Amino acid sequence: ESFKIDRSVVEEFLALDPDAWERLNADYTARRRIGEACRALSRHAFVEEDPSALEELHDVLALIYQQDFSGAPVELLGCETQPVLRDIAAILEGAVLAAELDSISEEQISAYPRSGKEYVHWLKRVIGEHPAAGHPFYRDFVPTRATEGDFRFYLAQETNLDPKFDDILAFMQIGAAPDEKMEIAGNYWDEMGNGKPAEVHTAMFAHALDALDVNDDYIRRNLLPEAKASGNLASCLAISRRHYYKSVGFFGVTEYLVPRRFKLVVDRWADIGLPREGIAYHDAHISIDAVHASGWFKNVIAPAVDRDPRVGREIAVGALIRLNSSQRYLDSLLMHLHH
Amino acid sequence: ESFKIDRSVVEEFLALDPDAWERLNADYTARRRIGEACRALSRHAFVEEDPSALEELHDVLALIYQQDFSGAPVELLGCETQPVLRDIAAILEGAVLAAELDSISEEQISAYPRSGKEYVHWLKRVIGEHPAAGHPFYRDFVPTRATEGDFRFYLAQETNLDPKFDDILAFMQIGAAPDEKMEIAGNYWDEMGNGKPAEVHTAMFAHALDALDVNDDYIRRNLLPEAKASGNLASCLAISRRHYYKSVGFFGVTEYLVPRRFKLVVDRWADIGLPREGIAYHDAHISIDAVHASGWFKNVIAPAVDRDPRVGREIAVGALIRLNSSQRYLDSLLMHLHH
Ligand SMILES: [Fe+3]
Ligand SMILES: [Fe+3]
Ligand SMILES: [Fe+3]
Ligand SMILES: [Fe+3]
């Protein structure tokens, strides 16, 4: 009743039994108040730019996307969480995305060539203009200074994304046109080890986490606010059909940048003697994501633009959202690792 | 304002521009009224059992799932449809599922053995008890009487499901445990032609539709109410994490029954001389879905039950939902084809 919403409040919702959820869902006054509380939190996070409200907002979103991405537990199979959780997510997402678009000007997303092959050259040039494409965390800190403790902290941040990449792709390809769908589908099958459990990418990522004891409590204690924002952006864009073309740009940039970044991590990892089985994940992606990137530009981005060049604007927006949010993440990471 | 909701009203929503959607989403009085209208429609459909309200309800749900499953058009990329469409779907789904569970008694879903391999034998026995496992449309009408016009009408009904089976699987495997995920993932890759566009299952299904001119207008004109219900059930169960274990039973029954059904269709199709390229889809699935069924029981159902035997109840519910809804669909189909 004219209340404040935070993560603990949403945990309380998720503890409700199925009848309690049905009663909440029927109460549009309670639901109005929840929405008003979300708008209040959004203003604190992004208008007043309170860092504590910003982290709270991303903690709330992260809890909701956990429900979207995780196998449901038996205890909650009967609980209708969509009317409330989708309202909270729409309000908080709308504020998160509006803040991203505040950093993107019309001049950045409008002068692209309106054909697919040409658009790819333009986008790669635009990516190369952005500092996140050659960030000193990878280019300078990793090869010269990174210790085991640095990599442990870094890997904690990377759990925002890599542990769910297969399901990000599965969400993205829903309803996709044939050429784009086939490329995303092959990418997904690659993520699924092409049928071999040992080669499933989330499994090999978990082995890197094990190698440095990046345990669940360490992650929760050490996850940076911008790491939470990065993970929430990826989830937000993957799970709505309407964000598909942004996602194409967002995960296109991801595939494109992984090989240079991971080569630097892998080389340092070996230099300082860290567990060889620990970088199977990264070593693999050096060649795998080069293929994924080429396939992504040629078979997702270029056909999409050729089908309807208007989507070039959405793809460029998604690319810049990934670049901008990556820059803030890496700057925050490098700042915490320096100190 | 104390209004009646139908498909045309939801089409009106989907015609709103992004600002109009934002204003609707902020208006919890308008949203309360929409929910009340959905509850009214549910009562007409399932309490009063008005056949016209039942078809309207499934027309509304079908339009919403279209948004969930289809590539978003450029014109609607900025429209936040989730707060309203997810409320409508939760209310109408809750009524659809409650009507299904009305036909399922506790004695049917409770005496299963609480281990995976044993559970599979029990479930196959339970399926074999149900009339939909050997329905006369397939067993008697198809081999002895079905004409080209009969198959054209039948294929129109089958568009409720087969054109989206790859994305049903993609939705289902989100967050799934490793053994179950790997099996669903291989099934999905099979649906995606194992990377060969000509072998993509939705593509070969569309060729069967072409062979008999099952065009979009024919489908809309001829789709039976129970065909709409079947398609909506599949969508409902696939898209919520909490319905995962029901989905495991629902699409498990689907995989299990397809080979005997399709063998009968294929044999008749050839007998009456219909286009040979028209049944590439069905001919393939005779052997493919036998493998999919075996894999599904051994690698999805049995590991799930061994992980937590409590889910055996959900899987049995989903299996009976598929069996019951299939029976009503096939009885309605055979009745219309007889007349
Ligand atoms: Fe990968
Ligand atoms: Fe990749
Ligand atoms: Fe298939
Ligand atoms: Fe299959």
How would you summarize what this structure contains?
Two copies of one chain form a homodimer. By secondary structure, chain A is an all-alpha fold. The first copy, chain A, has helices at residues 7-14, 18-26, 28-47, 51-69, 82-101, 116-129, 136-145, 148-158, 165-172, 178-191, 201-211, 216-222, 225-239, 244-271, 280-307, 311-338.
Helix and strand arrangement:
Two copies of one chain form a homodimer.
Chain A (H helix, E strand, L loop, with lengths): L6 H8 L3 H9 L1 H20 L3 H19 L12 H20 L14 H14 L6 H10 L2 H11 L6 H8 L5 H14 L9 H11 L4 H7 L2 H15 L4 H28 L8 H28 L3 H28 L1
Bound molecules: fe (iii) ion (4 copies).
One fe (iii) ion binds next to helix 15 of chain A.
PDB class: oxidoreductase
Keywords: metalloenzyme, oxygenase, diiron, oxidoreductase
Assembly: dimeric
CATH homologous superfamily label of the largest domain in chain A: Heme oxygenase-like
Which range best describes the helical content of chain A: under 10%, 10-25%, 25-40%, 40-55%, 55-70% or over 70%?
over 70%
Report the CATH C-level class of the largest domain in chain A.
Mainly Alpha
Instruction: State the CATH architecture of the largest domain in chain A.
Output: Up-down Bundle
Cα gyration radius of chain A (Å): 20 Å
Order of helices and strands of chain A: HHHHHHHHHHHHHHHH
* Oligomerization: homodimer
CATH overall fold name of the largest domain in chain A? Heme Oxygenase, Chain A
The class by helix and strand makeup of chain A works out as mainly alpha
Distance between the termini of chain A: 43 Å
Number of strands of chain A: 0
Biggest sheet descriptor of chain A: none
Strand residue content of chain A: under 5%
* DSSP summary: helix tally of chain A: 16
PDB class: oxidoreductase
Keywords: metalloenzyme, oxygenase, diiron, oxidoreductase
Assembly: dimeric
Entry title: Crystal structure of N-oxygenase HrmI with the diferric cofactor partially loaded
